[PDB]
Structure 1
Amino acid sequence: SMNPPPPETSNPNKPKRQTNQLQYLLRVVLKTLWKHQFAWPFQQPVDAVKLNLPDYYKIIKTPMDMGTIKKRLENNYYWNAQECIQDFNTMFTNCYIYNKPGDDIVLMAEALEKLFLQKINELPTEE
């Protein structure tokens, strides 16, 4: 099996804007998670060819990773902060769907998700 193409990160047909919530998601939320000890399995799409996981994209039909989210923020792909929060939540849910309790990658996801939730509790005010 091939890997699927990664998620779209730029779309010329979508309107663009900057907002303080989007700035905060990139320059505070994403940045904090990106540097975390446990972030590396989440920094790029799962390469199921290289890792020989041919069932990964038979189970996970909405793949997402922080590399894609970073590119989406940097390309102004999101209009609403909740779109970006939704992608982080998809990334974590995909981990819990594919993996078992007790697995290392689940412990890693749980720690990142805890930190993610703490950081988005401090999202600044909407315009």
Structure 2
Amino acid sequence: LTFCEIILMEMESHDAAWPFLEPVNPRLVSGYRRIIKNPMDFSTMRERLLRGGYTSSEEFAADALLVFDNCQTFNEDDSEVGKAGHIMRRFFESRWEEFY
């Protein structure tokens, strides 16, 4: 779980992290609630990680990948948010793999 902290810190602070820092506001984003069944974002991961709530690095990785799965589901790949999401997804998978 020390690596989870390192990786979360790095994602929070990444230039491309802007769409993922806070939960999506469904009042402002038409269709979000309908389309995305299990919302996830880095602030929600951070709350769970500090309150003690992950059992394994695998549960943490599952929430990270959920962020980027939702991103690809809702946003076109050539949209500003999609493009950011690809950078972030690749960053996560890269860092996660060079540690595990």
The structure that is helix-richer by fraction is 2
Is there any run of 5+ residues in structure 1 with no aligned partner, and where? 1-21
**Percent identity of the aligned residues?**
29
- What is the aligned residue count? 100
Larger radius of gyration: 1
Tell me: higher relative CO, structure 1 or 2? Use CA pairs within 8 A at least 6 residues apart. 1
Gaps of 5+ in 2: none
Q: TM-score, with normalisation over the residues of structure 1? A: 0.74
Normalised TM-score (structure 2): 0.93
| Deviant stretches of 4+, over 4 Å | none
Partners of 1:98 and 1:61 lie apart in 2 by: 11
Counterpart-to-counterpart distance in 2, 1:91 and 1:105: 12
Q: How does 1:35-74 map to 2 (within 5 A)?
A: 35-49=13-27, 51=28, 53-74=29-50
Alignment root-mean-square deviation, CA = 1.1
Aligned to 2:3: 24
Does residue 85 of structure 1 match 2:67? no
Deviation by residue 1:61-91 (Cα, 9 ceiling, x = unmatched): 0100000001111111011110010001011
